[PDB]
Amino acid sequence: ATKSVLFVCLGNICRSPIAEAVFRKLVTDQNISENWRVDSAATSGYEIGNPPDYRGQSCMKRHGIPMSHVARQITKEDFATFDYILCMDESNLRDLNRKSNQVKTCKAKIELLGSYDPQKQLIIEDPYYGNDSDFETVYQQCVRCCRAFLEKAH
């Protein structure tokens, strides 16, 4: 409602829907989900319409955080409506900045989600060709960064 955040990755089937679900849980547990619009989107069109990769679901189920999303690509409107667009890596950041320069209204602050990590792990690497441990690392990064971002936005 008041505040809004859009998490962004390459496909919007793993890193960003995980961040979105982690963040939504955090605000729900703190009684303030009503004050937040939370969403996720992709820089690419590779996965439009698809659900989160089941490898990410396996990880999320272990941690007891339900995750549901239909992959969608970032749009021009997103720059106008979101307070924060938080992405995973330097390619995402570059692509988002490119798209932001094509619109009249950019309300969004566009940043690396990892810039909020107290442990300074700046990049949330694509685990597509990784193993279970890589998905777990992404999850842990999302938890740390989402907590810090909620605490105090840049």
What are the catalytic residues? 9, 15, 126
CB atoms within 10 A of CB 106: 18
- Residue 46 or 58 having the CB closest to ligand 6VX: 46
d(CA 71, CA 94): 20
- Residue 9 or 143 having the CB closest to ligand 6VX: 9
Pairing verdict, β 109-112 and 84-87: parallel
- Residue 11 or 114 having the CB closest to ligand 6VX: 11
Q: Which residues bind ligand 6VX (CB under 6 A)?
A: 9-15, 46-47, 53, 55, 126-128
Contacts of 67 (CB under 8 A, 6+ apart): 17, 18, 20, 21, 52, 56, 57, 60
Nearest residue to ligand 6VX on Cβ basis:
11
| In the complex, minimum distance from the CB of residue 72 to ligand 6VX, in angstroms, rounded to a whole number | 12
Cα 55–57–62 angle (5° rounding)? 105
Length of the chain: 154
| In the complex, minimum distance from the CB of residue 35 to ligand 6VX, in angstroms, rounded to a whole number | 27
Helix H or strand E segment including 2: none
- Residue 80 or 96 having the CB closest to ligand 6VX: 96
| In the complex, minimum distance from the CB of residue 24 to ligand 6VX, in angstroms, rounded to a whole number | 17
d(CA 120, CA 147): 14
| In the complex, minimum distance from the CB of residue 19 to ligand 6VX, in angstroms, rounded to a whole number | 10
